[PDB]
Design a protein around this motif. Structure first.
Motif, PDB file in Angstrom:
ATOM      1  N   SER A 151     -25.010  31.309  62.676  1.00 14.53           N
ATOM      2  CA  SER A 151     -23.978  32.309  62.425  1.00 14.53           C
ATOM      3  C   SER A 151     -24.521  33.511  61.653  1.00 14.53           C
ATOM      4  O   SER A 151     -24.150  34.652  61.927  1.00 14.53           O
ATOM      5  N   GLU A 154     -26.640  35.917  63.889  1.00 11.95           N
ATOM      6  CA  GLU A 154     -25.806  36.746  64.751  1.00 11.95           C
ATOM      7  C   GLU A 154     -25.244  37.941  63.992  1.00 11.95           C
ATOM      8  O   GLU A 154     -25.142  39.038  64.541  1.00 11.95           O
ATOM      9  N   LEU A 158     -25.677  41.884  64.962  1.00 10.59           N
ATOM     10  CA  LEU A 158     -24.507  42.742  65.119  1.00 10.59           C
ATOM     11  C   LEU A 158     -24.553  43.928  64.160  1.00 10.59           C
ATOM     12  O   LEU A 158     -24.212  45.051  64.535  1.00 10.59           O
ATOM     13  N   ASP A 197     -21.087  33.516  74.139  1.00 10.39           N
ATOM     14  CA  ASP A 197     -19.719  34.020  74.258  1.00 10.39           C
ATOM     15  C   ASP A 197     -19.645  35.542  74.372  1.00 10.39           C
ATOM     16  O   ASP A 197     -18.607  36.139  74.084  1.00 10.39           O
ATOM     17  N   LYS A 199     -20.806  37.931  72.607  1.00  9.73           N
ATOM     18  CA  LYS A 199     -20.426  38.577  71.357  1.00  9.73           C
ATOM     19  C   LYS A 199     -21.151  39.906  71.164  1.00  9.73           C
ATOM     20  O   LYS A 199     -20.634  40.818  70.507  1.00  9.73           O
TER      21      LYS A 199
END
Length: 508
Positions: A151, A154, A158, A197, A199
């Motif tokens: 997590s 990511e 981002l 997913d 993202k």
């Protein structure tokens, strides 16, 4: 006053750090002694004093690079200043989410310094040193992928996409080339789209639409400069990579990407449209034997879309009337109300010259969706129906809509016919139905001229065409009643007829 002394202290510390990195007779243990000492001798007590140190260090790194290059030293020799800075930075990120917040602060830091050297020195901006800074950070974080949690990693990616957008060519035009290299970078581009997913697709598509748009504007102005070529070639290479490595993304966000590009930029747009999904093997030669498209499995499958056509119309407050027209058939007042919203991009002595592209793209997309629901309900399971209300709704729409506005209307439909899918299927049948409607009528003939003029522009270029593009045109050619050869548009251009005839003679 006293502030000048503080900066001279920060600069002195960074100089000692560089010398330690350059000295080959230095033990590995020496480096970690230096960093522990930074906090004990009150050189860096708080987190803000560290950032300030890193503000000054990145500033010096740029000055050191220009010094080295102008001296005549190798480009690798000049990079040692900024490289030593990144190394010190990595030491702190491995000392440990605080690490995510630490990485984000340094990214935002680099942005501030980059903008500073662009504000202070617009024409004297050097992208090389700043590109090296972000490129190294991208590489180092990729190495520490196993360290961070799934997590936390990511979030860093981002945040990286967020900071890159803060350095737009619109806000930092002197950083355009390097910024382009950062978006296309092998340490960012594959990993942002690699996130589960999807993202990272949304942050990446934001960067790309800025990139494609930047190229498009350069291209329109007849550029000869190295900038334009470097920017356009970067666009070609990034789209070629995206098509082969991530075709699903290029398929899902196809509409948003095409909007960033000018319509006449046919090759750039074609790279988006010619993309095919890995699972699809239904791609058959259009010329072969007596190919029958109707007997194809994937022709009923719905392609994925990230476009919010339904929501864009609702926000424009035109969604309700369109659905009402798709049910009750075409209405004069309805088309007129849609057309006005299309031409709007009102007061006394005011005429519209611009046309809303996105609103048109929204309307066009809804005609296909309503056909999908019909097919599921019908026992025939046919997507396209010649006698339906929507096809007559679309028929009247093209007729009453402004000539410039109908150009974008038709261009939207052609953009949808690509690889074998429901969208390609519906608009292939629909575009021919409009062309065949009231052939005797003169006004409809003019619309037929607008359709062929769009189709001809796409096939004029020497590059691989979309599957649905060739299929639709061949049917427009093969059919006797369509009489494409004796359309006043085909009678007008001799060179376009030559190119078209070659396609007609290859039409086995």
């Amino acid at each position: 006053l006293e502030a000048a002394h503080l900066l001279e202290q920060m600069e002195y510390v960074f100089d000692e750090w560089i010398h330690l990195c350059n000295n080959p007779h230095a033990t590995e243990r020496a480096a970690m002694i230096f960093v522990h000492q930074l906090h004990s001798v009150q050189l860096v007590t708080n987190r803000d004093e560290f950032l300030l140190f890193l503000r000054h260090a990145l500033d010096k790194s740029v000055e050191r690079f220009e010094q080295g290059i102008h001296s005549g030293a190798s480009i690798a020799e000049s990079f040692q200043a900024v490289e030593a800075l990144v190394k010190l930075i990595i030491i702190f990120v491995k000392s440990h989410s605080a690490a995510v917040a630490f990485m984000d602060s340094i990214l935002a830091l680099g942005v501030l310094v980059a903008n500073s050297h662009h504000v202070k020195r617009g024409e004297n901006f050097n992208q090389r040193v700043f590109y090296r800074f972000f490129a190294l950070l991208l590489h180092e974080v990729g190495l520490l992928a196993g360290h961070f949690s799934k997590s936390h990693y990511e979030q860093i990616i981002l945040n990286f996409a967020a900071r890159l957008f803060d350095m737009r060519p619109n806000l930092l035009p002197g950083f355009a080339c390097a910024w382009a290299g950062l978006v296309s970078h092998r340490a960012f581009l594959p990993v942002i789209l690699g996130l589960p997913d999807e993202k990272g697709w949304a942050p990446f598509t934001k960067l790309l639409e800025q990139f494609l748009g930047c190229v498009g504007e350069l291209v329109k102005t007849f550029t000869v400069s190295s900038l334009g070529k470097e920017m356009y070639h970067a666009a070609l290479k990034i789209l070629i990579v995206l098509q082969h490595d991530f075709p699903i993304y290029l398929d899902k966000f196809r509409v948003q990407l095409c909007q960033s590009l000018p319509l006449h930029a046919t090759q750039l747009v074609n790279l988006i449209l010619a993309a095919i999904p890995p699972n699809c093997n239904s791609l058959a030669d259009p010329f072969q034997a007596g190919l029958k498209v109707d007997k194809i499995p994937d022709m009923k499958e719905r392609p994925p879309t990230a476009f919010d056509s339904a929501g864009l119309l609702r926000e424009a407050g035109l969604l309700d009337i369109l659905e009402r027209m798709l049910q009750n058939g075409p209405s004069e007042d309805g088309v007129a109300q849609i057309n006005h919203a299309i031409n709007k991009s009102t007061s006394f002595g005011y005429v519209p010259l611009g046309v809303n592209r996105r609103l048109i793209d929204a309307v066009v997309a809804r005609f296909a969706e309503f056909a999908i629901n019909r097919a599921s309900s019908r026992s025939d399971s046919a997507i396209f129906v010649a006698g339906a209300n929507d096809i007559k709704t679309l028929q009247m729409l093209v007729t009453e809509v402004s000539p410039e506005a109908r150009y974008y209307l038709v261009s939207s439909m052609v953009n949808e016919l690509r690889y074998p899918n429901a969208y390609t299927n519906y608009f292939s049948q629909a575009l021919l139905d409009i062309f065949g409607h009231d052939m005797s009528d003169p006004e409809e003939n003019l619309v037929r001229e607008q359709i062929v003029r769009v189709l001809l522009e796409r096939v004029l270029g020497y590059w691989p065409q979309p599957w649905g593009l060739i299929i639709t045109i061949l049917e427009l050619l093969k059919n006797d009643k369509y009489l494409f050869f004796e359309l006043p548009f085909i009678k007008a251009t001799p060179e376009v007829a030559e190119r078209f005839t070659a396609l007609a003679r290859s039409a086995a």
